[PDB]
Design a protein around this ligand. Structure first.
Ligand code: ZJM
Ligand code: ZN
Length: 197
């Protein structure tokens, strides 16, 4: 029938991480494509989670998610209303605010949270899904300028990742980017004051 044939939307799945625990940032893959698709459909992820910044995927998109204040945060435009796969099955969001482009799930067991930044620094560092660390000069509360011209493609897929201060605290999570003739010029982020329940 029509209703028998209705497909169920799958879960966000953790497929990797951006390791920030030593003197060198680097990306790690923890699931390949077939395992991602299977875990999206079941909602059951028995991998052990580590760290603060996760690489996440749906059936159709990949982006980042960052734990702050005991919640794994990402962008609504990547995750929508989806559950996240976990060792106990799919986990429903505990925070959803489309108006901030923001969602959150309770942080996975075994993860760690970044500390909110209280520095008021304007020297920021954007962490990409390739573990590039991009200097950004803060312009107000939710925005920053890129110091050096990079093609916008270098930033695609990095929404949900952190902006860090010089001390490595979280200033916000990356939401959107502004470019001119293909060159990324500025970034827009969800400030950390909002990354709390
Ligand atoms: C559906 O419900 C909602 C609700 C709220 C909501 N809110 C916003 C802001 C929103 O924006 C969408 C998504 C976001 C995006 O692509 N995000 C990044 C990413 O990487 N995503 S991603 O991981 O590839 C992806 C797609 C998840 C997998 C970080 C960029 C990287 C590259 C940019 C590429 C070209 C696009 C340039 C856009 N620029 C822009 O909007 O600039 C704004 C307007 C001017 C000022 C500034 F704030 C931009 O960045 N966009 C446009 N969608 C929604 C949708
Ligand atoms: Zn700080």
């Amino acid at each position: 029938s029509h209703m028998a044939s209705m497909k169920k939307k799958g879960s966000v799945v953790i497929v990797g991480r951006i390791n920030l625990s030593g003197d060198t940032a680097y990306a790690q893959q923890t699931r390949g494509e077939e395992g991602c698709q299977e875990t999206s459909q079941t909602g059951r992820d028995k991998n052990q989670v580590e760290g603060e910044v996760q690489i996440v995927s749906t059936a159709t998109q990949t982006f980042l998610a960052t734990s702050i204040n005991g919640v794994l945060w990402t962008v609504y435009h990547g995750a929508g209303t989806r559950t996240i796969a976990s060792p106990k099955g799919p986990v429903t969001q505990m925070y959803t605010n489309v108006d901030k482009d923001l969602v959150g799930w309770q942080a996975p067991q075994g993860s760690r949270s970044l500390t909110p930044c209280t520095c008021g620094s304007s020297d920021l560092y954007l962490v990409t899904r390739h573990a590039d660390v991009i200097p950004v000069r803060r312009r107000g509360d939710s925005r920053g300028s890129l110091l050096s011209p990079r093609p916008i493609s270098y930033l695609k897929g990095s929404s949900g990742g952190p902006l860090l201060c010089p001390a490595g605290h979280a200033v916000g999570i990356f939401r959107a980017a502004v470019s001119t003739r293909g060159v990324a010029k500025a970034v827009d982020f969800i400030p950390v004051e909002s990354l709390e329940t």
